[PDB]
Design a protein around this nucleic acid. Structure first.
Ligand SMILES: [Mg+2]
Ligand SMILES: [Mg+2]
Ligand SMILES: [Mg+2]
Ligand SMILES: [Mg+2]
Ligand SMILES: [Mg+2]
Ligand SMILES: [Mg+2]
Ligand SMILES: [Mg+2]
Ligand SMILES: [Mg+2]
Ligand SMILES: [Mg+2]
Ligand SMILES: [Mg+2]
Ligand SMILES: [Mg+2]
Ligand SMILES: [Mg+2]
Ligand SMILES: [Mg+2]
Ligand SMILES: [Mg+2]
Ligand SMILES: [Mg+2]
Ligand SMILES: [Mg+2]
Ligand SMILES: [Mg+2]
Ligand SMILES: [Mg+2]
Ligand SMILES: [Mg+2]
Ligand SMILES: [Mg+2]
Ligand SMILES: [Mg+2]
Ligand SMILES: [Mg+2]
Ligand SMILES: [Mg+2]
Ligand SMILES: [Mg+2]
Ligand SMILES: [Mg+2]
Ligand SMILES: [Mg+2]
Ligand SMILES: [Mg+2]
Ligand SMILES: [Mg+2]
Ligand SMILES: [Mg+2]
Ligand SMILES: [Mg+2]
Ligand SMILES: [Mg+2]
Ligand SMILES: [Mg+2]
Ligand SMILES: [Mg+2]
Ligand SMILES: [Mg+2]
Ligand SMILES: [Mg+2]
Ligand SMILES: [Mg+2]
Ligand SMILES: [Mg+2]
Ligand SMILES: [Mg+2]
Ligand SMILES: [Mg+2]
Ligand SMILES: [Mg+2]
Ligand SMILES: [Mg+2]
Ligand SMILES: [Mg+2]
Ligand SMILES: [Mg+2]
Ligand SMILES: [Mg+2]
Ligand SMILES: [Mg+2]
Ligand SMILES: [Mg+2]
Ligand SMILES: [Mg+2]
Ligand SMILES: [Mg+2]
Ligand SMILES: [Mg+2]
Ligand SMILES: [Mg+2]
Lengths: 205, 57, 134, 113, 109
RNA sequence: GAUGUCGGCUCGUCGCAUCCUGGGGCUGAAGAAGGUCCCAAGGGUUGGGCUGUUCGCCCAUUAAAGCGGCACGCGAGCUGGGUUCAGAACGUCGUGAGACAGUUCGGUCUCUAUCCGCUACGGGCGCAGGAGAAUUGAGGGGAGUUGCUCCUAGUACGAGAGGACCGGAGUGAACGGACCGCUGGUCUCCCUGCUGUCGUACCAACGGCACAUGCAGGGUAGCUAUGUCCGGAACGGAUAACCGCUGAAAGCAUCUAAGCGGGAAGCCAGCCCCAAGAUGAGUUCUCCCACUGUUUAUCAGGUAAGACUCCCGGAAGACCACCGGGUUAAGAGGCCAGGCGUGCACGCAUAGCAAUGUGUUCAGCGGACUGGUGCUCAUCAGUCGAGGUCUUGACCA
RNA sequence: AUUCCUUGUCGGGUAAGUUCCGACCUGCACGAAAGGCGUAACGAUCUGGGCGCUGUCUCAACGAGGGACUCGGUGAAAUU
RNA sequence: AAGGAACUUUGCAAUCUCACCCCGUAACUUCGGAAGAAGGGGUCCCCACGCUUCGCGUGGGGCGCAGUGAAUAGGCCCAG
């Protein structure tokens, strides 16, 4: 249910009581409501809010129409959340309480194309026992004539990164509302200045 | 070792492969002065103009 | 971080000068004796971890002799130790205290400092023979 | 990957002898013709060296002299040009794209003050 | 990837300063005494590490210095957060005449 | 007219005749620890010593250290120790040349993937107008391991010694994902020290060469694991062995012959990821609108909404793609300020016979960090992009 | 360098030693110029063990340079 | 980083060692050797003093993490 948008600002050291907590600083700036999707409107229950501000001079006629219909003023980013309401618009105030466990989604830093070691954790090869250009390669890719083919899904070199990743049960250390900042324990995927969606827990714990 | 093709590739195949070697013709603009043609954000190679006049003659 | 093959010096009068690691264990110390393993694998021993070890150099005259095997508990890593404040400890040399299967040390006293983490793991007697609980 | 600078298919020493030669040259004669890239890569090294020479003290001469090994050019950039750039907050240069060469297909370019 | 006008610095530094503390002007080479409080179960003991400062590192809440001591015949180094709750106080004991800023070389002696 | 052969390495995936872990009948099952059998293949199944080993014995652990298939899986993937070429030697056989599935030392393992198959990434067209965005999830993939301690409880049980189910709590190991704040690594010219030599006229100061950094000492951002955060579940629905309810055939009895309930780490759902080329091509919000063309020119042109090309960049990346900025402009560089690294510049003065020391100087220098600023280049411009087929039905003026 | 039975048996070293060393003698199938048993020294010989040191390894990282990739120029091959 | 042969058929490979001076040096032996066995120290700049000069000894002072300051440059041992 609960959810909001913001940007990953960075990681830092703070102390609650006497242990050094590592904290990721998130800015969940205010989100306007824009679209409210219901059953008889769209089939399914959801709300579409928006995050980063955007000047008119950069906004499509159709997009302007969109935003204008709910009179909101325009945003570089829209996203949906299944099963959500209140009224007005949405700041991380109230929406999160300190101590509450949340789920943080982002887009992992992308690594480009990566061999089987870096990508999958292959074992590599003998750096020295006569190994002949087989230091980093993935060994064998199959059996023999049964089944004369290569398994579908077989892990091998490829585009590692730039993927959507959700970390579960991160703990809301601090909330400075009206700076729209959530101090969150641990680590969120994706680089500084990246987009993150924060959510209630998926799990009860 | 020493891989090799199993079978001659048909004229048809070979040519299907080539379906992407189309050169891309320049987008060409006409110099606002001396009037022949130039590339966007390059110096017009006829006169030498890039607003006043940079390369020589 | 200790692992099989990894020699350490000995921090007691037990009589082993030098022991070489052999296995690592994730046993604790609970209720009756020591406990029995935390699983099969576990590759690195650090400070307040029991390991198993074989004696390699010993004192002529003393309880424990060259080749003896025997459990030991790890009291000085060169590796770093991170306490929950951010503080980090780290000692120039790697060292342990040979023990029995109740955990209590085989020696009369511990030599050199020991990591306060031994207190966490309820190694009272070791923690008490110790010149300093850094 | 926020790293910066160009490998320019060269060893560290080469890379340096490049930027120094092409700096010395641009300063020796107000404008030069060069690969568009080598230009891109030259702009901020020379612009900075100018800002150094813009100090006028002997330190800033000796400084410039390490990167620029020809007396006459040093003397030029210290005494003649840096003092001219006096009032401009950097941007001491600019780059023009001439275009494609015959031998090896490469967009050349023009860089100047 | 969300392009928002934002001083990342000042936002960070905001937070980061409620957790920042400055200690005396000691330098690498200087001998120093760190009076730390330790918790032994319910009890709060006071233990006191004193040695050479071989490196200062970081800044903001992250700043840290590194004391090296010899204790009971064994080399030991420790690393403190300027703002560790468990570091009560820091006192310069002697000033060093050091040419570097790191001092690792002292690790043989 | 060649289907490379033992073992290891690397990479997996399957069977179940189940090593562990879960459920259950029986027990020569008090408890605890077992034995055996039935259901169960989700996940897991350690490191070493000896040998070329497969195996097997041993060390030390473990919930367990399962058995097999996949050309005794895997040499256009690596090894090349075993074996089976030429050399040489021993033993043995042979009058000999030679010989042995005896031993021994030595002994070349072939840069380019065409098709299928596989991992990644684009181009095309399709989805009855042209566009910008937001999405349902048909379907598919990943994940699925376990110890220990504590409470219950020194309770049930037990003469006692000992010592629970069940339920609840807590902490790890391995593995996975993300991350770089911390602790560290690296950081090829960011800072300093050092030597031989050649140079910049000489001194002083500097540059080259001594690696493709001459050596050393540090070292930001990035990027990293040994570093840190989080995870495996909870609930539910159908089941297996198995346990029962009601209950005839067969007045008794019977879990079944009609029916009904309880029941596993397995099944389906729930978790995370992809997903309408789901050609069955889906839904929603919005924008443009009803243009021009002697059918000698019945399909095109100029266009709108909107994009692309081109430029400058990017935490995106082989290319392509993706994100941002493109003067109504802070997009990058520069410049300014700050941060941070290095650790006290040059010059001058002083002390000193000198080496050198001190002051000026928390100095000097400057790659990637944080912001500001119109100093530089993002100029000018081109290319492309709708006019919405028909059939039936429903509502409408 | 000779042993089939074979990882012979005991000892040594090792946490653990089918290899190595010593001893034993039951020499499948040693033995005296096809030399026998020793031998200081010599060996890019072979075999085992130790010290030191190390990315050989746990377990891989970061960096560099040369390719691989992209653009312009010239443009092969085995195979079919 | 920590560990240090846990790799493997085998330390294969790669590191450690590295020049010159002084100190010192085993079993064993054909008395030549083994032997550079092993191992330890020194090494740069200034100044004065002495000596046979290109140089070295002695004393005291100086600077750095480090003085064959970069390049050339033995890893050793035990036992078959
Ligand atoms: Mg990237
Ligand atoms: Mg490896
Ligand atoms: Mg088939
Ligand atoms: Mg013994
Ligand atoms: Mg090239
Ligand atoms: Mg550091
Ligand atoms: Mg054939
Ligand atoms: Mg063939
Ligand atoms: Mg055969
Ligand atoms: Mg299995
Ligand atoms: Mg067979
Ligand atoms: Mg096979
Ligand atoms: Mg094959
Ligand atoms: Mg062989
Ligand atoms: Mg004969
Ligand atoms: Mg192909
Ligand atoms: Mg589905
Ligand atoms: Mg399909
Ligand atoms: Mg699956
Ligand atoms: Mg109790
Ligand atoms: Mg009792
Ligand atoms: Mg950082
Ligand atoms: Mg770092
Ligand atoms: Mg002259
Ligand atoms: Mg000079
Ligand atoms: Mg030269
Ligand atoms: Mg030369
Ligand atoms: Mg060089
Ligand atoms: Mg060279
Ligand atoms: Mg360095
Ligand atoms: Mg991990
Ligand atoms: Mg840990
Ligand atoms: Mg049920
Ligand atoms: Mg495109
Ligand atoms: Mg590009
Ligand atoms: Mg600055
Ligand atoms: Mg410079
Ligand atoms: Mg900037
Ligand atoms: Mg034996
Ligand atoms: Mg023998
Ligand atoms: Mg003979
Ligand atoms: Mg080409
Ligand atoms: Mg080390
Ligand atoms: Mg060994
Ligand atoms: Mg070698
Ligand atoms: Mg002699
Ligand atoms: Mg010597
Ligand atoms: Mg000194
Ligand atoms: Mg010295
Ligand atoms: Mg050498």
């Amino acid at each position: 249910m609960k959810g909001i948008l913001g940007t990953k600002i960075g990681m830092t050291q703070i102390w609650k009581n006497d242990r050094a907590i590592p904290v990721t600083v998130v800015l969940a700036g205010p989100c306007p409501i824009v679209q409210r999707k219901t059953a008889q409107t769209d089939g399914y229950e959801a709300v579409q809010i928006g995050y980063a501000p955007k000047a008119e001079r950069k906004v499509n006629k159709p997009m302007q129409g969109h935003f204008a219909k709910a009179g909101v003023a325009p945003t570089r980013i829209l996203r949906e959340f299944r099963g959500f309401a209140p009224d007005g618009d949405s700041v991380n105030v109230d929406i999160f309480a300190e101590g509450e466990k949340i789920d943080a989604t982002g887009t992992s830093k992308g690594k480009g194309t990566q061999g089987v070691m870096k990508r999958w954790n292959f074992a590599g090869g003998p750096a020295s026992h006569g190994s002949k250009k087989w230091h980093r390669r993935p060994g064998s890719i199959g059996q023999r004539k049964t089944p004369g083919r290569v398994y579908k899904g077989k892990r091998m070199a490829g585009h590692m990164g730039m993927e959507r990743v959700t970390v579960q049960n991160l703990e809301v250390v601090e909330i400075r509302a009206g700076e729209n900042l959530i101090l969150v324990k641990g680590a969120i995927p994706g680089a500084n200045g990246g987009l993150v969606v924060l959510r209630s827990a998926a799990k009860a714990s | 070792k020493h891989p090799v093709p199993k079978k001659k590739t048909s004229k048809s195949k070979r040519d299907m492969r080539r379906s992407h070697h189309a050169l891309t013709a320049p987008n060409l603009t006409e110099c606002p002065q001396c009037h022949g043609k130039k590339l966007s954000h390059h110096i017009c190679p006829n006169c030498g103009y890039y607003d006043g006049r940079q390369v020589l003659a | 971080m200790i692992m099989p093959q990894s020699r350490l010096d000995v921090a007691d009068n037990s009589g082993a000068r030098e022991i070489m690691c052999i296995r690592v264990l994730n046993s604790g110390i609970g209720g009756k004796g020591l406990t029995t393993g935390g699983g099969g694998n576990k590759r690195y021993a650090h400070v307040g971890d029991i390991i198993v070890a074989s004696v390699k150099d010993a004192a002529p005259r003393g309880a424990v002799k060259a080749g003896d095997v025997v459990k030991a508990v790890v009291v000085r890593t060169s590796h770093a130790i991170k306490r929950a404040d951010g503080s980090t400890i780290r000692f120039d040399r790697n060292a342990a205290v040979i023990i029995n299967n109740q955990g209590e040390p085989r020696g009369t006293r511990v030599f050199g400092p020991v990591a306060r983490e031994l207190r966490d793991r309820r190694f009272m007697k070791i923690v008490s023979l110790a010149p300093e609980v850094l | 990957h926020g790293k910066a600078g160009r490998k320019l298919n060269r060893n560290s020493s080469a890379r340096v002898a490049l930027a120094r030669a092409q700096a010395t040259a641009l300063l020796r004669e107000g404008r030069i013709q060069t690969t568009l890239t080598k230009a891109k890569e030259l702009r901020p090294f020379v612009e900075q060296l100018i800002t150094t020479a813009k100090g006028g003290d002997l330190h800033s001469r000796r400084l410039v002299a390490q990167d620029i090994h020809d007396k006459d050019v040093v003397r030029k950039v210290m005494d003649e040009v840096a003092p001219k750039y006096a009032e401009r907050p950097g941007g001491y240069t600019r780059i023009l794209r001439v275009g494609t060469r015959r031998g090896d297909g490469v967009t050349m370019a023009l860089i100047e003050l | 990837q969300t392009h928002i006008k934002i001083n990342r610095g000042e936002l960070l530094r905001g937070i980061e300063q409620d957790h920042t503390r400055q200690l005396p002007d000691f330098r690498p080479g200087d001998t120093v005494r760190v009076d730390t409080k330790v918790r032994e179960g319910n009890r709060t003991r006071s233990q006191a590490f004193e040695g050479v400062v071989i490196a200062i590192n970081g800044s903001g809440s992250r700043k840290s210095f590194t004391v090296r001591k010899i204790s009971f015949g064994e080399g030991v180094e420790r690393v403190f957060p300027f703002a560790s709750p468990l570091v009560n106080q820091v006192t310069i004991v002697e000033r060093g005449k050091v040419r570097r800023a790191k001092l690792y070389y002292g690790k043989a002696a």
